[PDB]
Structure 1
Amino acid sequence: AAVIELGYMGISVKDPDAWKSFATDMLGLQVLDEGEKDRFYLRMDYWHHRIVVHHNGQDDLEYLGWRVAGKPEFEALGQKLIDAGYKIRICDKVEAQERMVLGLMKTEDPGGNPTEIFWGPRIDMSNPFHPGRPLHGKFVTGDQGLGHCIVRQTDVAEAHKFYSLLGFRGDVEYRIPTAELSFMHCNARDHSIAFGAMPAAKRLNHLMLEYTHMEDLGYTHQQFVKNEIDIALQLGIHANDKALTFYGATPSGWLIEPGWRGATAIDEAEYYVGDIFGHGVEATGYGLDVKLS
């Protein structure tokens, strides 16, 4: 029994209108508004949603939702967490329905990040993805889940223990002149969660979303430049996942990492002291002032 993907994430925001325009125009995500007073959804694929956007918010992560294959794996992982001393709560039907899942449990990772484990997402096969702007392609999701994030941790060894229990694999992959960053995978995506020991004002450092087409990544980069949105780290290729990516500001102040061409996760641990090219610092103050080239 193990987590198999980053299924969904919840964020809260102070400016929902800015977020709708940002998500659609700058990224190509689809806005779905179900008429709820306090939230809307962002789509990437056939799932009803991948991101829940809550308003009256704190401009930060609200929860990560990690999928397991089914009820037997849900029950086994729950018991594993209990046996290891972690505190979990199995949610009732109302709470599961709020997330639009068949089964749901809530806990917190060792860094304080609200963590949900679920099975049975709602897939709207009748409602194909329709991007918020014209796209050459689509997003890479499927068995790789929605993307990845770096989140704050206060104790890297304890974080690693928790994510290992959940079925993730990975360790320190960068020693940057020394800062150490750890990257963990639960499927073919090179990593789904990553972290280090750096102090951080927010739970969320960045969210990476992956395009199928280089043309969409480039156009997104151009949208950031034309609209004069801060780029924290310039275009570059990571040594671990081999993806072409950049990092730009969101209206909430944490970063989005649009990217293209991520490689398959490997179980064999290796480490690097820098990236392949690029990812030079441009705008500062976003929690990623590392020297990568």
Structure 2
Amino acid sequence: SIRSLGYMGFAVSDVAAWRSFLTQKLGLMEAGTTDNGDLFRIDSRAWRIAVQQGEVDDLAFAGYEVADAAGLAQMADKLKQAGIAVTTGDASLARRRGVTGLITFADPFGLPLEIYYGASEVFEKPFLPGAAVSGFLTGEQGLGHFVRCVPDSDKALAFYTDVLGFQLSDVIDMKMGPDVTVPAYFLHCNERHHTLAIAAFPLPKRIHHFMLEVASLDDVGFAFDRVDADGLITSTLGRHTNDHMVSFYASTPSGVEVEYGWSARTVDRSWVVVRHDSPSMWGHKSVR
């Protein structure tokens, strides 16, 4: 059973721009370079985000974490039984990722996915942010979330819920012009309101954005100014209707956006699926 989103890798055209963006603007910690690419940290894990040179300028792969080897075995079986082509990552890949075991495959629309267990911790190299950030919220909630753009939401849903086991949190009917309303589906696999959202948006990228959650309002406020100085803000500060996260959006060097937020509410046993007609209570004025 998937416990959380553990890591993500980006294939970008300008690695230097990304390095500077992630550390100086967002405050991530530079963790060195390896055959896994330029590594970045936000907590005790050896790395959470990897940046590799590439032409797509998009998310290259995402890794989902299971608790142990038994969990890995369950998932591999679930995928096989579903007719998905799964590959047991070899020792070489596992060493490159810094994990104990992993299986690889792709989602229905070609996004490379990895499910692994036993990632590396580096408590002996205490996290020191590249900019003034009090802390990032990970723990049992994992890395954060990302919005997967797909040509067919229903096909994507069946795969993520029935095969991968994500559960629906809620749906937002996004009005994109008078003759267009696109439902966005928010899915959770732990307490975090959503670790994955699915929507059929007309974008050239695999994801609309990825999100990182910080510990205080000031972390968000200071980061906003740092990003704003370079004219990279895409949405003003606002609060979402569904997860109640206070956040802003900005452009990364690849065009893909990043959401930087604070104070999201979690999902619990009493949770019930609901629908919304707006993605924000207040703010989030688009300045794109």
* TM-score of the two chains, using structure 2 as the length reference: 0.93
Aligned equivalent of 1:237: 239
1:210 and 2:207 matched: no
Aligned equivalent of 1:20: 19
Change (3 A) 1:5 1:243: same
Task: Note the C-alpha offset of 1:27.
Answer: 0.4
Among 265, 271, 275, the alignment partner of 1:271 is 275
Q: Secondary structure at the match of 2:21?
A: helix
Task: Note the C-alpha offset of 1:172.
Answer: 5.0
Q: Secondary structure at the match of 2:227?
A: helix
The answer to whether the 8 A contact 1:110-1:154 is kept is: no
Aligned equivalent of 1:40: 38
**Superposition RMSD on alpha carbons, in Å?**
1.4
- 1:89-146: CA deviations, max 9, x gaps? 11111111111111111111112211110011111111111101122x1000000111
Aligned equivalent of 2:9: 10
Work out the CA distance in 1 between the residues paired with 2:174 and 2:89. Answer: 41
The answer to whether the 8 A contact 1:110-1:153 is kept is: no
The answer to whether the 8 A contact 1:211-1:259 is kept is: yes
Work out the CA distance in 2 between the residues paired with 1:38 and 1:264. Answer: 32
Deviates more, 1:261-270 or 1:111-120: 261-270
The equivalences for 1:216-231 within 5 A come to 216-229=219-232, 231=233
Aligned equivalent of 2:157: 160
Work out the CA distance in 2 between the residues paired with 1:269 and 1:160. Answer: 15
The answer to whether the 8 A contact 2:157-2:198 is kept is: no
Change (3 A) 1:38 1:75: closer
Aligned equivalent of 1:286: none
* TM-score of the two chains, using structure 1 as the length reference: 0.92
Change (3 A) 1:93 1:86: same
Deviates more, 1:84-93 or 1:167-176: 167-176
The answer to whether the 8 A contact 2:132-2:219 is kept is: no
Aligned equivalent of 1:52: 50
Task: Note the C-alpha offset of 1:171.
Answer: 5.8
Work out the CA distance in 1 between the residues paired with 2:153 and 2:106. Answer: 15
Work out the CA distance in 1 between the residues paired with 2:151 and 2:170. Answer: 15
The answer to whether the 8 A contact 1:210-1:259 is kept is: yes
Which one-letter code corresponds to 2:274 in the other structure?
A: E
Work out the CA distance in 2 between the residues paired with 1:205 and 1:188. Answer: 22
Work out the CA distance in 2 between the residues paired with 1:56 and 1:12. Answer: 4
4+ residue segments displaced more than 6 Å: none
Change (3 A) 1:37 1:84: closer
Q: Secondary structure at the match of 1:176?
A: strand
Which one-letter code corresponds to 1:111 in the other structure?
A: F
Task: Note the C-alpha offset of 1:38.
Answer: 7.3
Work out the CA distance in 2 between the residues paired with 1:46 and 1:38. Answer: 18
Aligned equivalent of 1:76: 74
Work out the CA distance in 2 between the residues paired with 1:49 and 1:180. Answer: 33
Which one-letter code corresponds to 1:276 in the other structure?
A: M
Unpaired runs of at least 5, structure 1: 284-293
Task: Note the C-alpha offset of 1:227.
Answer: 2.0
- 1:64-109: CA deviations, max 9, x gaps? 1000111001101111111111111111111111111111111111
Work out the CA distance in 2 between the residues paired with 1:176 and 1:251. Answer: 26
The answer to whether the 8 A contact 1:234-1:278 is kept is: yes
Work out the CA distance in 1 between the residues paired with 2:103 and 2:5. Answer: 15
Work out the CA distance in 1 between the residues paired with 2:102 and 2:4. Answer: 15
Q: Secondary structure at the match of 1:112?
A: coil
Count of residue correspondences: 279
